Amino acid sequence: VLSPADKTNVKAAWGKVGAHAGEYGAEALERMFLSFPTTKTYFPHFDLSHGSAQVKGHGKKVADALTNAVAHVDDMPNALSALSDLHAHKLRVDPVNFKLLSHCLLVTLAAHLPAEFTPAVHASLDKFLASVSTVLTSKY
Amino acid sequence: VLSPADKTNVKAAWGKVGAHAGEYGAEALERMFLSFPTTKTYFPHFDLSHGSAQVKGHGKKVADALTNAVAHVDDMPNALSALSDLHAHKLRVDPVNFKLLSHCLLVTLAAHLPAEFTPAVHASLDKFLASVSTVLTSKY
Amino acid sequence: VHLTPEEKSAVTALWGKVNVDEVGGEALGRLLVVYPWTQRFFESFGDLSTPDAVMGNPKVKAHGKKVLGAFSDGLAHLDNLKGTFATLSELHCDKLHVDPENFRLLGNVLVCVLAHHFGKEFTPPVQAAYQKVVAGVANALAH
Amino acid sequence: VHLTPEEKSAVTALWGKVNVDEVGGEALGRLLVVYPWTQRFFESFGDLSTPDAVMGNPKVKAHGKKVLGAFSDGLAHLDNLKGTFATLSELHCDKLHVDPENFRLLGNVLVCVLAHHFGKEFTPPVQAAYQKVVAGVANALAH
Ligand code: HEM
Ligand code: HEM
Ligand code: HEM
Ligand code: HEM
């Protein structure tokens, strides 16, 4: 459950992330694939090399999903219904992988926004990504 | 996130539990302390032997909280706010302990209600206890 | 796994009354039902949509028999769990990529199945002994 | 922990530039802030209510210095991590009762702190190498 303060912090942090969302998401996916190779088993039709256009496109989709989740933070379960069904009913992704991707997103945000990534902002983004992962992993 | 189906299953299962809630909670607390003695560090002022009056009373309190949570499944964060501020703010309980207590409650319910503990009911109760633990481990 | 003589005697006596064909299959079916992401691994087995289809699967029953046979082999070598579960650990990590948390989940489901099948005879000390044995099997498999 | 020569050289080169006095305190304070239940083990450090009070705590800074010293000692003995962290594992398991998940959380926070301090110099390969070293320290401590 999120408070108002960390919700405002997450909104401000993502608003300052802005237009670099596609590159940030592609880098987060690359970091997850490189440091957690077991997650590569969920992408058998992909070209998981560095600088791949397919990985860049998937990162763009992931970033757009995170952006609309930021825009609809108060009502996540029904704003992410399509993604939650694809992740849970079709893909059946282990929530450990969601934790791994959240950690890699945090690492990417830390590496690309030093001034933005304060300890409070870190906590707010951690629990925002935790809420997103819980919504996507829930089966309902 | 819970569906209507597991909400109905949980409500029926706990209504059938009924008046044995105090004994079931006392047994769940006893099972957890013996199975995972690390959880005993949260109760340094208790008498943690078998048949202890303090343990039986705390089991009664836990069972009453669970019954109230069953009665208020759709507004759990606003129903268990006092307990949320107790464990997260002051006790600072690790959510691993919540997972262990949920598992011990499931074991107690399985050992006391064979006919009631069908595989669907097991999934419903698991998700309900996970929701309760998530509510109690959050900060507002 | 370090156990007292009383704990080992209690574990062995409960195991003798265990019906392998039912217990292994029921534990695997409850794993697949309670934790649906585990069906990614078991997609080959067949229809696994409803709980009735998961519990009424001959492939699930046979695989549960295999899993409980491995559990019995681990019980017979409780002081050599790491060496007993080396081939299975390699199989699950290198070829199947099973996350180690899933072994813990399956062990907990097996403990719940034992409690369900043995009722009041599944005392808290017996549960503690079995929790430790299940943790040792899971740690040996995750190595 | 098995590392490639490139990973070992990159890890050593990046750890050579790490400011211990600030990085240890940063990692400990961020752990206490992001995961507030960890303050149960550090309630004796004084004021830990707000993030500004956690990050500006001399006791937190000194303990983070000790934690980074332990991490460097482990990084110097990557092939003997289990034997290097025997006393620390005993201390954390028997006297302090710290759950093993907390070590993984602290390692992830340390990796995030390193990324924050080094920016673009913290490439995904360097992050992967540091992830495996952090996992090895956590598994050595959980033993
Ligand atoms: C944590 C936040 C996540 C978000 C916001 C997210 C979002 C998305 C989006 C927007 C798509 C595109 C769906 C489409 O284009 O139809 C997608 C697909 C997919 N996601 Fe995620 N995802 C997340 C986590 C994960 C993780 C951790 C994994 C696996 C380790 C994963 C596995 C997949 C797979 C396999 C696809 C299919 C892609 C394809 O078939 O091309 N997702 N996700
Ligand atoms: C579903 C899970 C849980 C529920 C519903 C629950 C419920 C409760 C209730 C009703 C109380 C009584 C509050 C009062 O008397 O003022 C309480 C207190 C307490 N709980 Fe929990 N609890 C849960 C899990 C846990 C776990 C897993 C731990 C520790 C391992 C824990 C630690 C405590 C402590 C230390 C107290 C204080 C008792 C006292 O001061 O006498 N709780 N909880
Ligand atoms: C203590 C935990 C476990 C034990 C003792 C165990 C034991 C076994 C055994 C004995 C086999 C048969 C291997 C063979 O015949 O060559 C097997 C295979 C397998 N295991 Fe496990 N297992 C455990 C946990 C899990 C979990 C939790 C999953 C998935 C979530 C899993 C997935 C599989 C799969 C997919 C196979 C191969 C099935 C097939 O080839 O048809 N295992 N395991
Ligand atoms: C994961 C890597 C970790 C490393 C390398 C590490 C290192 C150390 C070291 C070297 C000490 C000795 C301090 C002294 O002798 O004065 C220590 C003590 C301690 N550690 Fe850790 N630690 C780790 C994780 C954790 C975590 C995650 C927690 C809590 C959530 C924790 C809780 C403590 C506590 C409470 C002390 C005693 C502090 C005191 O008594 O003032 N440790 N640790």
Residue numbers in the entry:
A (entry chain A), B (entry chain C): 1 to 140
C (entry chain D), D (entry chain B): 1 to 143
Relevant lines from the article:
As monitored by UV-Vis spectroscopy, metHb has a Soret maximum at 405 nm, indicating that the heme iron is in an oxidized state (Fe3+) and incapable of binding O2. To eliminate these possibilities, we next assessed the effect of the protective oil layer on grid preparation and downstream cryoEM imaging and data processing using our metHb sample. Briefly, we created two metHb samples – one without and one with the protective oil layer – by placing 15 µL of metHb (~ 125 µM) each into two sample cups. One sample was used without modification (non-oiled), and ~ 70 µL of aerobic Al’s oil was carefully layered over the second sample up to the brim of the sample cup (oiled). Two cryoEM grids of each sample were prepared using the chameleon following recommended guidelines. Both metHb samples were imaged using the same microscope parameters with approximately the same number of micrographs for each dataset collected. We did not observe any noticeable differences neither in the quality of the sample stripes on the grids nor in their behavior during data collection. Both datasets were processed independently but with similar steps and parameters to allow for a direct comparison of the resulting densities. A comparison of our 2.78-Å resolution non-oiled and 2.71-Å resolution oiled metHb EM densities did not indicate any notable differences in their overall quality. Indeed, the view distribution and the total number of particles were similar between the samples, each resolved to a similar resolution and demonstrated similar map-to-model validation metrics. D, E Comparison of metHb densities determined with or without the protective Al’s oil layer detailing no obvious differences in the metHb densities between the sample with oil present or not.
Here, we present a workflow that utilizes the SPT Labtech chameleon – a next-generation nanospray cryoEM grid preparation device – in an aerobic environment to freeze O2-sensitive proteins under functionally anaerobic conditions, which we term (an)aerobic. Demonstrating the utility of this workflow, we determined high-resolution cryoEM structures of deoxygenated human hemoglobin (Hb) in various liganded states and the molybdenum-iron protein (MoFeP) – the O2-sensitive catalytic component of Azotobacter vinelandii nitrogenase – in a reduced state. Our workflow maintains (an)aerobic samples by protecting against or eliminating O2 contamination prior to loading into the chameleon, during sample aspiration, and throughout sample deposition on self-wicking EM grids, respectively. Finally, we detail the effects of O2 contamination at different stages of the workflow and show how to prevent their effects. Together, we demonstrate reproducible high-resolution structure determination of O2-sensitive proteins of varying complexity and size – as small as 64 kDa – with a workflow requiring only minimal modifications to a robust, widely available EM grid freezing method.
